[PDB]
Scaffold this active site. Structure first.
Site, PDB file in Angstrom:
ATOM      1  N   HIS A  19      -7.286 133.443  67.137  1.00  0.00           N
ATOM      2  CA  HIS A  19      -8.206 134.495  67.411  1.00  0.00           C
ATOM      3  C   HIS A  19      -9.384 133.983  68.238  1.00  0.00           C
ATOM      4  CE1 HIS A  19      -5.707 137.367  65.371  1.00  0.00           C
ATOM      5  NE2 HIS A  19      -5.802 136.772  64.198  1.00  0.00           N
ATOM      6  N   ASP A 130       3.264 122.066  69.547  1.00  0.00           N
ATOM      7  CA  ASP A 130       3.906 122.222  70.842  1.00  0.00           C
ATOM      8  C   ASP A 130       5.389 122.576  70.646  1.00  0.00           C
ATOM      9  OD1 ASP A 130       2.354 119.191  72.123  1.00  0.00           O
ATOM     10  OD2 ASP A 130       1.517 121.244  72.033  1.00  0.00           O
TER      11      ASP A 130
END
Ligand code: HEM
Length: 207
Positions: A19, A130
């Site tokens: 966010h 990742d």
């Protein structure tokens, strides 16, 4: 088990990172390839430093099977940044943001102390993210901005075929690591600080 306690202990920070204004704008298509490139340039700085710490800890004999050199991102990232920027110009132009100077200083301390537990925390925060949310990010950059897949090497993990199996195996390696109570506590605390540094990279990019 450690993999579970890592995920649990950082799940709130991970939600906050989702966010962040910069990363949220980026992933909703409100920015562009230039801002994705600014992120990658900061990441090349901290991955260069992280992979020096990795190299030190791997050489010390700690967590060796976890620290697979195949995960190394910095040189693939530099190839991506050559494509994104059109040349090698970026190398003398880029500067670490204040968030990156802090993160890199911590990684250099872990390197020079050869602090195995602290390094595995930073390894989990960056590489499992990742390997796990990376397609999402690579798909968004292709969809919203038309980034060429050849400039998203960072997300491809060349040399890994079965990605889901690799992830499973990575978390089993974490679970099987030998840690004292003091070493596990230190690792968990470090993982929280790893998310803190990452969130501040995005805050600084958003300035
Ligand atoms: C500070 C930035 C971020 C870091 C350091 C980070 C790190 C991580 C790590 C370590 C995991 C694997 C968790 C585990 O299996 O134990 C993960 C999972 C994942 N991440 Fe992130 N991540 C970040 C931001 C984001 C953002 C912005 C997105 C939005 C696309 C995202 C999407 C995902 C998704 C979809 C997963 C699978 C689990 C979940 O939904 O929470 N990540 N991340």
């Amino acid at each position: 088990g450690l993999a579970v306690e890592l995920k649990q202990s950082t799940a709130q920070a991970h939600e906050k990172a989702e966010h962040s204004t910069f990363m949220s704008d980026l992933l909703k298509g409100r920015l562009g390839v230039a801002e994705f490139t600014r992120l990658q340039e900061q990441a090349w700085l901290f991955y260069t430093a992280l992979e020096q710490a990795v190299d030190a800890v791997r050489a010390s004999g700690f967590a060796e099977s976890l620290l697979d050199p195949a995960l190394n991102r910095a040189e693939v990232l530099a190839r991506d940044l050559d494509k994104l920027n059109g040349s090698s110009e970026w190398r003398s132009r880029i500067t670490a943001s204040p968030a990156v100077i802090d993160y890199v200083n911590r990684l250099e301390e872990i390197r020079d102390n050869v602090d195995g537990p602290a390094l595995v925390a930073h390894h989990y925060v960056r590489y499992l993210g990742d390997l796990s949310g990376g397609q999402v990010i690579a798909r968004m950059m292709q969809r919203h901005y038309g980034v060429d897949p050849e400039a998203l090497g960072f997300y491809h993990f060349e040399g890994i075929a079965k990605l889901k199996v690799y992830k499973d195996e990575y978390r089993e390696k974490l679970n099987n690591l030998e840690l004292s109570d003091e070493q596990r506590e230190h690792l968990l605390k470090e993982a929280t600080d790893a998310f803190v540094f990452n969130h501040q990279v995005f805050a600084d990019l958003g300035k």
